[PDB]
Amino acid sequence: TAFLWAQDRDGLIGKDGHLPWHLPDDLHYFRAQTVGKIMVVGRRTYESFPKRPLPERTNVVLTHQEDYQAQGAVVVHDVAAVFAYAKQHPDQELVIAGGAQIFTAFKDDVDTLLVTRLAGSFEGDTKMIPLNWDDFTKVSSRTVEDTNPALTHTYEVWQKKA
Numbered sequence: 169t170a171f172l173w174a175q176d177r178d179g180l181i182g183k184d185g186h187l188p189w190h191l192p193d194d195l196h197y198f199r200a201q202t203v204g205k206i207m208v209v210g211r212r213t214y215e216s217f218p219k220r221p222l223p224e225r226t227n228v229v230l231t232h233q234e235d236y237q238a239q240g241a242v243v244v245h246d247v248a249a250v251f252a253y254a255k256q257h258p259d260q261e262l263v264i265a266g267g268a269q270i271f272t273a274f275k276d277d278v279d280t281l282l283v284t285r286l287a288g289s290f291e292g293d294t295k296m297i298p299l300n301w302d303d304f305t306k307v308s309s310r311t312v313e314d315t316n317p318a319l320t321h322t323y324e325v326w327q328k329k330a
């Protein structure tokens with residue numbers, strides 16, 4: 169399992185799940201990472217996503233209640249089922265596109281964490297769930313500078329150690 173998300177300096181993800189900040193660069197990064205790999209998106213994500221489903225990619229819509237249904241992404245209401253699905257396709261890695269509730273559910277059993285940090289700050293009604301940084305040790309990171317400081321962002325990857 170892999171964690172793919174973007175956050176500001178303060179620690180907020182956005183509003184209603186949708187990224188309030190328009191960073192075509194960071195957005196490009198998310199899209200590129202989900203190419204040729206299995207990704208899981210929460211129900212809130214299904215509505216927050218810009219356009220689904222993606223081509224040449226495997227998208228999955230995960231919700232707490234089985235009443236909910238999603239188009240373009242496989243709908244799974246079983247936490248165990250999501251793990252098994254990734255297990256079935258060892259060739260393709262599983263990445264959690266969100267949301268935070270989804271992240272929390274699989275946060276404990278994640279080996280790779282991807283985080284995007286923005287120098288600028290944004291305000292919204294949705295904040296990212298707490299993470300244990302000390303438990304995970306950063307393996308590598310990349311820094312990209314945009315025209316505007318707020319726009320400028322960096323990519324950091326953490327791997328769980330035991």
Ligand SMILES: COc1cc(Cc2c[nH+]c(N)nc2N)cc(OC)c1OC
Nearest residue numbers: 172173174185186187195198216265284
């Ligand atoms: C491609 O656009 C979006 C992409 C994403 C996913 C996403 C973006 N950026 C990063 N760094 N990680 C992600 N998982 C979430 C969104 O909103 C929830 C988007 O629309 C604003």
